[PDB]
Amino acid sequence: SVPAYLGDEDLTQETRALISSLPKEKGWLVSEIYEFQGLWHTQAILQGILICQKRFEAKDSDIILVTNPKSGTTWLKALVFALLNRHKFPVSSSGNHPLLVTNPHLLVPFLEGVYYESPDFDFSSLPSPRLMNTHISHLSLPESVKSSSCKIVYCCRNPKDMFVSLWHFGKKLYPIEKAVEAFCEGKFIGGPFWDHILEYWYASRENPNKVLFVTYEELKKQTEVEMKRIAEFLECGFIEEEEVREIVKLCSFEGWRDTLSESLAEEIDRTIEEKFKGSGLKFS
Amino acid sequence: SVPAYLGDEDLTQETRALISSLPKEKGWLVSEIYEFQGLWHTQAILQGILICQKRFEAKDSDIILVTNPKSGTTWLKALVFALLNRHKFPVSSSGNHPLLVTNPHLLVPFLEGVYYESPDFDFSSLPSPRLMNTHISHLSLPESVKSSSCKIVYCCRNPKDMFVSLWHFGKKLYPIEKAVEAFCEGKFIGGPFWDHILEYWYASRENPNKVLFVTYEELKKQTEVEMKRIAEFLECGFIEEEEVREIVKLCSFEGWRDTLSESLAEEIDRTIEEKFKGSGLKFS
């Protein structure tokens, strides 16, 4: 009858009611999720964001990569990080490049977990500009990130793709057809999914100098194309074609299509089209 | 005729000669390795250690995991980190546990790369006690780590195992028989290998309250056994049997034996036995 007990008890001696007052669901998949600023968070993700907002101090030099919960981010982390550092750490430095020395999930911090398990971590001690990547949805960014001039890179994956993500946990740690109902309803780890996509979409169309929307499927189909387009969203000059090829070349060392059945796909397909009808965002 | 150029140019405007004065090798596998305090480092690893020593401030509360270059450390990182945090983040917290929210290579920092690519990073901002894990060999520890009371966990893998590690790079980025000659000679990324093992061995036998030596092969054979032994090297009380089982159980979601031929194995086998003859350390 009490939220779970996770870390830094101290900062929880005066902050533990807000959490215990939000709507929560249930089932067996996840324990006690809570609805915060419009979305349902696992208790873990929520305690983080909660300070992740109270403390994060953006810098116009930052660059936030936004992705969905549980889908791999390696390549998305290794990729760009390699793009920015082409002179600091030449893409030709092979074994000396940060990607051949340090795991990509230490080089590009997930605030959420940084603030979750290490609430005192000092991001101001990392080098600027900064590269990191998060799960949050628009309307929950650190005041500066919103009122600052960094650069947003939103990396979207088809829901049916993001769905399998959350599903995995339910496989590792009410069949799949049930979990889909929840996903499509929106009271599911990370949803209602059609908003953990549409505001960064309309966010990109509205203020294209701060927010960029890239589909993970196109990032894969034409990697060199999308990268040329990403580097032109937060840079200041020209980028050779061979520059982009040298980067992807370096990063080469880093689904539903086989998990859902036609009906559950169509089911999500029916909600995609609907939720995304008229918005301009069409899913392949 | 100049070492490569890697990051923070600033701190390299007065420090760049030391590097350019150490012995170096060659071949094609690696570019320009340098011998520092007895060992050969890739240029990257060396620039790190170099400040990693000038700056790191140990805390008797720390805990350093020492491992060899390139061999996977996930499970070794996920494992212990889970052991210490059994109350801060209950092993039963499943999806809320730091291991189901943050990649294990961000939770347990590799100083080397932290100091390499982020020289200003403030480790004093992480929570204590601290968990991190490094590649260095004994005689290169931060003054405090040596003159402090933290706790060393050295995780050794058979050389022929560590060898394949360094070899991999030569596969991704002079056949294998040649690389073995270098490994066995010692002027190879990380060697002379029989010392990136024997001082933490005699280090453990000499001061068993600070340095522990665990073979990765036993860590695998009897995971619950070794863990009970690790937790008793840097703790202060009793640990249930089911405690250890709950931890490994949680971490379950996280070679040469097929790469070397009998002759090259025996070749390294001939050097193991020799280098390790009389020392007490015998390899299976």
Nearest in space to B257 (alpha carbons), one of B284, B277, B282: B284
* Residues linked to residue B281 through DSSP beta bridges, in sequence order: none
CA–CA separation, B130 and B108 (whole Å): 8
Scanning every residue of chain A, which has its alpha carbon at the shortest distance from the alpha carbon of B33?
A: A96
CA–CA separation, B256 and B180 (whole Å): 12
CA–CA separation, B79 and B56 (whole Å): 24
Q: Which residues of A are annotated as a binding site for 3'-phosphoadenylyl sulfate?
A: 70-75, 157, 165, 216
CA–CA separation, B10 and B5 (whole Å): 12
Q: How far is CA B239 from CA A25, B212, B224, B233, B248, in A?
A: 35, 18, 12, 12, 14
The residue from A135, A138, A168, A196 that is catalytic is A135
Query: Which residue blocks in chain B are alpha helix, DSSP H?
Result: 43-52, 74-84, 98-101, 104-107, 111-117, 143-147, 159-172, 176-185, 198-206, 216-221, 223-231, 241-251, 262-276
What single-letter amino acid sits at B266?
E
Known active-site residue A135: yes
Q: How far is B280 from chain A (nearest CA, A)?
A: 33
* Cis preceding linkage at B129, omega within 30: yes
State the structure-solving technique. X-ray
Q: Which helix (H) or strand (E) holds A166?
A: helix A159-172
CA–CA separation, B270 and B278 (whole Å): 14
CA–CA separation, B55 and B37 (whole Å): 17
Start-to-end C-alpha separation, chain A: 44
Locate A93 and state its tokens. Answer: 């430095």
* Residues linked to residue A154 through DSSP beta bridges, in sequence order: A66, A213
Residue owning tokens 């920092």: B109
User: C-alpha angle with apex A105: A103 to A107, nearest 5 degrees?
Assistant: 75
Q: How far is CA B171 from CA A70, A239, A263, B176, in A?
A: 30, 30, 44, 10
Does A142 reach chain B within 8 Å, measured CB to CB? no
In chain A, the domains with their CATH numbers are 1-284 (3.40.50.300)
HSE (side-chain half, CA atoms, 13 Å) at B65:
27
- Compute the 3-state secondary structure of chain A and give helix, strand, coil in percent, each to the nearest 5: 45, 10, 45
Indicate yes or no: CB of B98 within 8 angstroms of CB of A105.
no
Count of residues in chain A? 284
Largest Cα–Cα separation, chain B: 59
Q: Which residues of B are catalytic?
A: 135
* Cis preceding linkage at A98, omega within 30: no
Helix (H, G, I), strand (E, B) or coil at B168: helix
Q: What are phi and psi of B66, to 5 degrees?
A: -110, 130
